[PDB]
Amino acid sequence: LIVTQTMKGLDIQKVAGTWYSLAMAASDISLLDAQSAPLRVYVEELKPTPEGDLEILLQKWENGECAQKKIIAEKTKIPAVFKIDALNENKVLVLDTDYKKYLLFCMENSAEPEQSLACQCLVRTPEVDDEALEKFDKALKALPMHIRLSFNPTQLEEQCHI
Numbered sequence: 543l544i545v546t547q548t549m550k551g552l553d554i555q556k557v558a559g560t561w562y563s564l565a566m567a568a569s570d571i572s573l574l575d576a577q578s579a580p581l582r583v584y585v586e587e588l589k590p591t592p593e594g595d596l597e598i599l600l601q602k603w604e605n606g607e608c609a610q611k612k613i614i615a616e617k618t619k620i621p622a623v624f625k626i627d628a629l630n631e632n633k634v635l636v637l638d639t640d641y642k643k644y645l646l647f648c649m650e651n652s653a654e655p656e657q658s659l660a661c662q663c664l665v666r667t668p669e670v671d672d673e674a675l676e677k678f679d680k681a682l683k684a685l686p687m688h689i690r691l692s693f694n695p696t697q698l699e700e701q702c703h704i
């Protein structure tokens with residue numbers, strides 16, 4: 543479990559709603575560097591199902607356009623860890639959230655050689671929250687990141703943060 547912080551006592555029903563991907567980092571550059579890069583994903587809405595799973599709406603750049611998408615992260619025995627099913631098993635971990643303002647998460651291909659890893663700082667409103675980027679920088683000091691992006695209020699409101 544390379545990522546070593548997780549949210550204790552995560553109540554998943556309280557992260558429902560609207561989110562902005564204020565920041566992103568990844569273990570290598572090709573994962574985030576272009577607008578089409580594999581894990582350049584912008585989060586729009588989180589929707590926990592009754593059964594404790596988590597529906598995810600995001601935006602991704604695709605055939606020259608910003609495309610809305612739907613992904614379900616299935617719950618696990620561990621409340622802060624969820625599993626996404628594509629050709630591979632990708633865990634999603636919630637490090638910290640205060641529900642009302644911010645939420646940090648990482649996601650890892652387990653266990654791709656070396657190992658690939660992307661994290662994000664979600665915030666509830668289009669505002670550079672000084673405080674939630676502290677916590678996001680702190681959480682990643684341990685982790686090996688090599689690209690780090692952040693957006694301003696203008697891009698937060700456009701599709702695909704253009």
Ligand SMILES: CCCCCCCCCCCCCC(=O)O
Nearest residue numbers: 583585598602611613634647649
């Ligand atoms: C707890 C909420 C965290 C949001 C997790 C977003 C995970 C993004 C996975 C995207 C991988 C598939 C991209 C695609 O659909 O082509």
